[PDB]
Amino acid sequence: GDDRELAILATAENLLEDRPLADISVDDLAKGAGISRPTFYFYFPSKEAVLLTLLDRVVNQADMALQTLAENPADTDRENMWRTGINVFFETFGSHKAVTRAGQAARATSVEVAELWSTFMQKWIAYTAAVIDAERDRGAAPRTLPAHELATALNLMNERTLFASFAGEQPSVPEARVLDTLVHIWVTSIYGE
Amino acid sequence: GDDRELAILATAENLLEDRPLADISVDDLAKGAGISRPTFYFYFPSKEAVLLTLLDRVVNQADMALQTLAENPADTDRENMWRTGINVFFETFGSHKAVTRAGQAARATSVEVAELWSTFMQKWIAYTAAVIDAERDRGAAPRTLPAHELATALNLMNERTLFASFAGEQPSVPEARVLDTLVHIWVTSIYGE
Ligand SMILES: CC1CCN(C(=O)NC2CCCCC2)CC1
Ligand SMILES: CC1CCN(C(=O)NC2CCCCC2)CC1
């Protein structure tokens, strides 16, 4: 049923680990999923549409994990507060590196993928800015830059730096160092004057 | 002569302001440059090769401007030191937004463009790290993160945030606010404990 759907998705995520979407075929996806090519087309219009769904699931998984954290304060200092939050993104995207990688590239060619990234980025930035503002209101953070602008740059840093690290780009921060690196820059830029 | 070359380059940069490289033709470039299509192919193997050269020129212009700054210290505090430096990139790339935009997209499809970006990014990060280290050695900056790792994240932030701003992506820092935004995060993360 939608078991077939789940299978198409699992096959695509598995195949994306080995090669880019350009070198994966609908025949490849159908085969791996144990269905014919016409049956594939019943569930998805295109292999592009498969990636879109995989990216949607990863993005929503991150978002739901962040919502959980936001509802349950971990009983910490400001550094571990931000760390735990950044770590949601580090772990979620880091657990799905092939979807992350293919979904990042697809931004250039797919308006739907571009808009999905854009929608969630705006949400995560707004949440970052709300937290910074609450930190300023409680007297914990100084009123320096506009919170939303600061939040924008810090989120864009995270996007670029996490994904470079996961892809092993040259240059990149080693994956085992990237959390500490980002948390330092967040805590210093948010609390520093 | 290489006047024709310069003309091909000017035409391409002009046309990239209006549409992506995919919708610009060799006939478009030849026409604008006042030459035939075979004459074009004498000077460049492909329209992809034209972009590569345009990107090479912009990247080297930034690099040369940074070398000039590095040879002549501006007589300032630490904040204006970093600002003047970031401003080299803000002004150089900001003066060539269409090449910036097309060259960023071309990373995904062109190994030569990927390697060009990568070579200069490594140079600029190494220079950033050298400056941070000299700041630490003089007792002006605390020994926090590994300088090279800090330098990596800050450069990757700048890349992503400048180029989002220039493209007017949603989300992005307004172009008129991006310099102040980046300088704050650099100065706080470099000098802060
Ligand atoms: C796809 C991006 C989205 C933003 N990212 C990220 O680490 N920011 C978090 C930090 C903790 C509070 C919410 C936002 C990087 C990955
Ligand atoms: C293409 C990138 C390269 C790096 N960028 C940049 O602003 N960094 C500068 C800051 C001043 C010292 C040298 C490095 C962003 C644009």
UniProtKB/Swiss-Prot annotation, chains A, B:
Q: State its role.
A: Involved in the repression of the monooxygenase EthA which is responsible of the formation of the active metabolite of ethionamide (ETH).
Q: Which Pfam families match?
A: EthR_C (PF21313), TetR_N (PF00440)
Q: What is the lineage of its organism?
A: Bacteria, Bacillati, Actinomycetota, Actinomycetes, Mycobacteriales
Descriptive protein name: HTH-type transcriptional regulator EthR
What keywords appear on the UniProt entry?
DNA-binding, Repressor, Transcription, Transcription regulation
Alphabetical GO CC annotations of the entry are: cytosol
**Gene Ontology biological process terms, A to Z:** negative regulation of DNA-templated transcription; regulation of DNA-templated transcription; response to antibiotic
**How is loss of this gene reflected in the phenotype of the organism?**
Cells lacking this gene leads to ETH hypersentivity.
This protein's assembly is summarised as:
Homodimer.
Q: Where is the HTH tetR-type domain?
A: 2-62
